């Protein structure tokens, strides 16, 4: 298919509070984490503290 969707919004929800953390762009490639580009800043996140959604 070589051309991934990218219509996914992923806000990195850790645990310091219930403040939604601005839906980043998903581009993960692995399993134990979640690499996510926000603007330009790429942020790998530990699975347990992330939340991805579509559309």
């Amino acid at each position: 298919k070589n051309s991934k969707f990218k219509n996914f919004r992923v806000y990195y929800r850790e645990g310091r509070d219930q403040l939604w953390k601005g839906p980043g762009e998903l581009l993960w490639k692995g399993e134990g984490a979640v690499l996510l580009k926000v603007g330009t800043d790429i942020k790998v996140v530990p699975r347990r503290k992330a939340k991805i959604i579509k559309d």
Binding site: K1, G15, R48, K49, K51, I53, K54
Partner: protein, 148 residues
């Protein structure tokens, strides 16, 4: 915490009844009903009922004689739910029921009626998913990852 397979089972009392509760930590999918006794048999029989429909994998509980029985041991393993022992979308369980309490007599019927209203009431906008609709958007998104 918000691992897509994470569910939490609180157990309570309401009107002299015992209300078992389970929340999908990553969304707000409340699942609950009245169990005639606070016991592993019931807690296993509930987790099982929960295991048999949602892509669950993590059950976070808060270590009590209830969710630490052999009955919940067998089920958990049998379905592959690694347990991890330790009120909000369980607090508003008692609340939202009060704004329903009349609609039907029994606590049984009333706690179920409660999860309906509870499961279908949207949040804000720009990601306006009701509890129920969002859960499916989260489960499905995992799958939408594919094995290309």
């Amino acid at each position: 915490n918000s691992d897509l397979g994470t569910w939490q089972m609180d157990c309570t009392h309401l009107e002299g009844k015992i209300v078992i509760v389970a929340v999908h930590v990553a969304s707000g999918f409340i699942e609950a009903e009245v169990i005639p006794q606070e016991t592993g048999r019931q807690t296993a029989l509930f987790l099982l009922k929960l295991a048999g429909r949602w892509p669950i994998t993590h059950l976070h509980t808060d270590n009590g004689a209830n969710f630490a029985s052999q009955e919940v041991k067998m089920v958990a393993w049998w379905a592959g739910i690694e347990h991890t022992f330790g009120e909000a979308m369980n607090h508003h369980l008692k609340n939202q029921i009060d704004r329903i309490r009349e609609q039907a007599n029994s606590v049984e019927t009333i706690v179920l009626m409660a999860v309906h209203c509870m499961n279908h009431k949207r949040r804000g906008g720009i990601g306006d998913m009701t509890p129920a609709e969002r859960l499916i958007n989260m489960i499905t998104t995992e799958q939408e990852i594919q094995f290309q």
